[PDB]
Amino acid sequence: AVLKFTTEIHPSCVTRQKVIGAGEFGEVYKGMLKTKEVPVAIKTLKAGYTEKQRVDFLGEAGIMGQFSHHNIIRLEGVISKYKPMMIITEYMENGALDKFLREKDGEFSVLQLVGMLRGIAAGMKYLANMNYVHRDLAARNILVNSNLVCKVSDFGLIPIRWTAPEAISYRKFTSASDVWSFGIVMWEVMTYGERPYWELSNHEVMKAINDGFRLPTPMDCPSAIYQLMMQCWQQERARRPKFADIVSILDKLIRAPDSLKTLADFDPRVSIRLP
Numbered sequence: 680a681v682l683k684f685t686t687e688i689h690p691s692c693v694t695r696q697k698v699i700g701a702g703e704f705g706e707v708y709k710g711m712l713k714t715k716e717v718p719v720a721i722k723t724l725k726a727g728y729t730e731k732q733r734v735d736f737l738g739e740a741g742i743m744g745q746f747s748h749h750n751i752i753r754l755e756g757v758i759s760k761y762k763p764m765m766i767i768t769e770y771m772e773n774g775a776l777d778k779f780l781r782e783k784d785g786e787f788s789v790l791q792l793v794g795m796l797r798g799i800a801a802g803m804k805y806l807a808n809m810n811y812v813h814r815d816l817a818a819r820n821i822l823v824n825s826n827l828v829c830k831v832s833d834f835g836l837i838p839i840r841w842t843a844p845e846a847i848s849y850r851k852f853t854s855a856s857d858v859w860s861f862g863i864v865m866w867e868v869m870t871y872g873e874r875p876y877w878e879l880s881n882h883e884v885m886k887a888i889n890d891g892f893r894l895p896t897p898m899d900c901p902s903a904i905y906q907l908m909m910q911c912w913q914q915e916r917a918r919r920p921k922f923a924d925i926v927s928i929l930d931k932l933i934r935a936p937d938s939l940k941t942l943a944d945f946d947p948r949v950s951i952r953l954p
């Protein structure tokens with residue numbers, strides 16, 4: 680029953696090509712799937728895995744099969760009847776959002792960037808409504824397709840700089856701590872992948888946040904977008920927007936795009952005197 684929303688794939692339909700990462704107990708590969716061949720990512724569970732690892736692996740496949748949304752990574756299927764077991768997802772040539780924006784600095788319009796954020800927010804609204812707390816939302820966990828559509832994923836791992844204070848302090852992870860993380864993602868997108876808090880150490884980040892400091896506005900950032908990320912970073916969990924509010928706000932800004940022309944004042948870190 681754990682695999683009720685998943686398609687079982689026969690191993691003869693899968694070819695593994697290059698290792699692209701590691702799982703908890705097995706490699707992740709780029710490969711091809713027959714069912715004209717479709718590129719896929721393939722996470723394996725290799726011989727010797729523990730009972731806990733098997734339960735976590737098939738549980739991961741199960742929840743991924745349950746999710747069916749434009750802005751959540753698509754599960755092609757699972758291999759559970761043969762060894763090694765496999766989780767097989769779609770593949771994106773553009774890759775992860777953090778590296779994508781750092782390699783494409785300044786190449787998009789404000790409307791394109793805000794559209795990315797709306798898609799991420801819609802995927803998160805779906806997850807939260809499905810009672811799934813992500814716990815590791817960050818641009819590194821978002822894939823970008825060749826239509827610029829962002830797909831929330833979870834590639835596995837402490838992301839202090841993305842994590843809400845209550846989650847750091849007492850391990851309270853909820854959809855409202857995911858909203859904090861979403862605010863950080865907004866900042867990542869609007870800066871083309873800058874490092875949150877720059878060179879501050881993890882301890883310095885937490886000290887600054889506890890003292891009320893917040894990331895300053897990105898350059899060229901719509902006022903409404905900076906205001907929204909600031910609301911995501913309310914210290915009091917209950918004061919943060921829900922994902923439904925975030926989607927609604929972003930939709931309204933996109934549909935009346937003149938709203939995005941008003942920019943938040945950027946605080947220069949360096950002034951040049953010239954005549």
Ligand SMILES: Cc1ccc(C(=O)Nc2cccc(C(F)(F)F)c2)cc1Nc1nc(N2CCC(O)CC2)nc(-n2ccnc2)n1
Nearest residue numbers: 699700701707720721722766768770771774831832833834
């Ligand atoms: C195979 C695979 C297995 C699981 C997941 C995953 O998201 N599970 C997940 C679990 C809980 C909640 C959610 C959810 F949806 F709620 F968020 C999602 C993604 C991929 N697929 C994949 N993994 C990678 N990795 C993983 C290893 C890492 O080291 C390197 C990157 N890369 C690419 N990839 C690259 C370019 N195009 C596609 N695809």
